[PDB]
Design a binder for this molecule. Structure first.
Ligand code: HEM
Ligand code: HEM
Ligand SMILES: Cc1cc(N)nc(CCc2cccc(CCc3cc(C)cc(N)n3)n2)c1
Ligand SMILES: Cc1cc(N)nc(CCc2cccc(CCc3cc(C)cc(N)n3)n2)c1
Ligand SMILES: C[C@H](O)[C@H](O)[C@H]1CNc2nc(N)[nH]c(=O)c2N1
Ligand SMILES: C[C@H](O)[C@H](O)[C@H]1CNc2nc(N)[nH]c(=O)c2N1
Ligand SMILES: [Zn+2]
Lengths: 411, 407
């Protein structure tokens, strides 16, 4: 079975066979496409096959499929499962799994980098204090004084779902949001609810516009504990504009390290519920979404005001003009401070090269167009005209519900 | 069974039930989403007729009435005897409006009920077709105050007597491959232009030559006609701030009129059904002007603005893109030719979608096409979950005639 994707700018046509290895489901049917829906404990029984497909993939990749070492490993894992209802990954398999979850992440435009990922094995961690230490080391290593390096830290896997390791923060580094009695927000509206939890847990909120949130860390199903990342580890960039001298007086900054900390890494049926991972930013994540979403910092008006754009009619494209200037500012600031960042032209062009290479070497590259296309200037990037096939491969990153909704408080 | 869509900007949640009345297939499966793919008998006909007439009589609040049963009976008798049937004028108008209403990729559907339907089912020759089309064009243009219109030529019979407009739009510019190696005019139309030349068209070989119509009646060989130039309203493109802009020699036509699609109503197939509205600015300024495989003007404009084109990260493409789109909108507005910007159009669509949810139980929408090709996330549609499904009546793609036609 073969599936073809066309690029409508280049007429380049690719053939996907990889989708035949797809296990998980999409949410779509022959009658309904759910392609724009944001969010569409295992038995021994289900675990054996999952482990086996994983180990088959792993041993093929090292050109050892069907070897004695492959067979012995299957036998050993099977025995471990029947006897203990679960199993332990070798370090090599963990590394491979983590790299593959990234490689398989169809919503990630940054996948050209998938094979350079530093894996920190934190499966010997037992306490929230232990977690804090691992996370500090990850932050320092990944930050690398502005010369960012991709990394993931992997905490112990789920057992009975009652002893989960979780990082309650959605990202390791994020700014607090405070709902004011007059209904306005100070700082980042995205993080109001989590900020409230931190405050309730005893965090002394400075109540500024750019307060780095404390880490809220849960080990072994215990109640989460608050920790402050050492400020000297939190690299930040003041935002200025190359031509507009008043831009700095907007008082904007952002942090350099994007580190997603609330997803679940699934490898060979095992579930790693705390697996913070980090890379570097594409400029639009900050300049389009973080700054210009109406539900976020929402700075478009103020920027357009200072530029004295005609704001009486939308058809002046004042929003669009301000949007570009903000995004220029973000890239210029990160570059000037030597903090790794990639523009959306460069990221999408690299992604297209990655995608074609993946088709050639792997038989496919699952990709979610809705997410891959940048949130500004969509059609002047090469991904816009690229047909993509979206399907779900394992290993994978998955969403999980926010822990404050599910946690059984011990007291 | 009942499906929820969330807006991530406003937290508003809508419940879709309309998808259960879905009847065509999406191309997707539980294993693979094809969301981003551009183009994924008597016995068959009666269910299709019944389905349609049920929705029609329901709409005029006469479901299960004698007039309903009688028409169902009438159409059935017509099919068994003739192997097809004819729509009443009222049914035709209902069907056409609903094909638009159901167009999941159309952002402008708030307008769906205000569609002027021209019944050209009495047409028999390519000459008749040309007359009907000039009239549509003049009506729709309305000296710049544009009005939505569709013109419906006779339905398919045995498939050997198809009416087709060979053009993809009623008004488009020619494309010519040059000894130079580059393309003159619109590169999207090079194959069609050559077909026009090989049919006898005297091509002026300019950058903006309005293509002639190539009309096929009753399955006959297609004939050429030039639309009266006085009926083709065009707009010279200037910028409100940059005086050099006009020097690029850019213009575009006022009337977007898609002419190559197939209208399907109650199993009947209208293979020639040109329809028109008015432009959203980005269609011209982003796609027509800036696509690499179209007029591809970004480099020239960036140059004139004296932007630093050394590095992608200066966002010179993005800067030029915005300016090109300001010029488009400015030029149309100044010349009083109806146009909508992507902010206004997407805001309207959100309002339409909420109307459709509360009055119909849903609104099929294809996010990939609805989100504008520039500034996506600063339009409300970006943050709106949409369910995409296929309802009938509908507009469908069909193979280009030069592949299908037997000469
Ligand atoms: C190296 C630099 C990277 C860049 C520039 C990059 C870029 C991006 C961007 C722009 C998004 C969409 C984000 C949004 O709109 O919220 C994304 C999504 C994602 N990335 Fe990356 N990425 C990078 C590295 C990584 C790494 C190291 C991992 C994991 C090891 C990763 C896994 C993911 C996943 C799982 C998603 C989508 C989440 C979902 O399914 O909703 N990426 N990437
Ligand atoms: C009146 C103002 C209208 C506006 C502003 C508008 C807007 C648009 C836009 C921007 C597109 C995307 C086109 C592209 O990217 O190539 C589109 C698609 C489409 N529109 Fe409209 N439209 C209008 C009127 C109409 C009318 C009158 C009809 C039919 C009666 C129609 C039916 C369609 C269909 C079928 C598609 C998508 C074709 C496909 O499936 O690929 N629209 N619309
Ligand atoms: C359910 C849901 C709701 C919502 N509003 N947002 C999300 C997105 C969460 C997420 C996942 C992966 C990457 C990023 C964006 C952050 C990021 C991470 C890395 C590793 C690199 C990079 N350039 N950027 N953000 C999910
Ligand atoms: C074969 C094929 C290939 C391809 N790459 N794209 C297409 C799209 C055809 C099409 C359909 C509807 C509207 C428009 C865009 C033109 C248009 C039409 C109307 C009625 C209003 C408006 N504002 N704009 N264009 C077809
Ligand atoms: C591959 C992808 O489906 C293709 O580029 C689409 C994307 N979205 C689009 N959206 C609109 N409105 N019009 C288009 O022509 C396209 N092209
Ligand atoms: C409704 C829609 O799926 C949602 O707004 C998506 C669209 N595309 C996106 N793309 C990226 N990269 N990030 C996002 O948060 C979103 N949001
Ligand atoms: Zn789908």
């Amino acid at each position: 079975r073969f599936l073809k994707v066309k690029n409508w700018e280049t007429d380049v046509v690719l053939t996907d066979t990889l989708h035949l290895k797809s296990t998980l489901e999409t949410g779509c049917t022959e009658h309904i496409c759910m392609g724009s829906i944001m969010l569409p404990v295992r038995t021994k029984d289900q675990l054996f096959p999952l482990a086996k497909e994983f180990l088959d993939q792993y041993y093929s990749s090292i050109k050892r499929f069907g070897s004695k070492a492959h067979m012995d490993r299957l036998e050993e894992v099977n025995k471990e499962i029947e006897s203990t209802s679960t199993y332990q990954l070798k370090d090599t398999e963990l590394i491979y799994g983590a790299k593959h979850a990234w490689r398989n992440a169809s919503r990630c435009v940054g996948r050209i980098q998938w094979s350079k990922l530093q894996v920190f094995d934190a499966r010997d961690c037992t306490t929230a204090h232990g977690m804090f230490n691992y996370i500090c080391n990850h932050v320092k290593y990944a930050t690398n004084k502005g010369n960012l390096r991709s990394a993931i830290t992997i905490f112990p896997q789920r057992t009975d779902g009652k002893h989960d390791f979780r990082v309650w923060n959605s990202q390791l580094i994020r700014y607090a949001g405070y709902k004011q009695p007059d209904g306005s927000t100070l700082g980042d509206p995205a993080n109001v609810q989590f900020t409230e939890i931190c405050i309730q847990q005893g965090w002394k909120a400075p109540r500024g516009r750019f307060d780095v949130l404390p880490l809220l860390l849960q080990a072994n199903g215990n109640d989460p504990e608050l920790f402050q990342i050492p400020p000297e580890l939190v690299l930040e960039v003041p935002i200025r504009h190359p031509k507009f001298d008043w831009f700095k007086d907007l008082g904007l900054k952002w942090y350099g390290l994007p580190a997603v900390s609330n997803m679940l890494l699934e490898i060979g049926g095992l579930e790693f519920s705390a697996c913070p991972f980090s890379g570097w930013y594409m400029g639009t994540e900050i300049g389009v979404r973080d700054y210009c979403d109406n539900s976020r910092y929402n700075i478009l008006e103020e920027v357009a005001k200072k530029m004295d754009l005609d704001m009486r009619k939308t058809s002046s494209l004042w929003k669009d003009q301000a949007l570009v200037e903000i995004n220029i500012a973000v890239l210029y600031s990160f570059q000037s401070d030597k903090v790794t960042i990639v523009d959306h032209h460069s990221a999408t062009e690299s992604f297209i090269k990655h995608m074609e290479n993946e088709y050639r070497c792997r038989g496919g590259c699952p990709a979610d167009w809705v997410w891959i296309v940048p949130p500004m200037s969509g059609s002047i990037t090469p991904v816009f005209h690229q047909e993509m096939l979206n399907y779900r491969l394992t290993p994978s990153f998955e969403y999980q519900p926010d822990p404050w909704n599910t946690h059984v408080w011990k007291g």
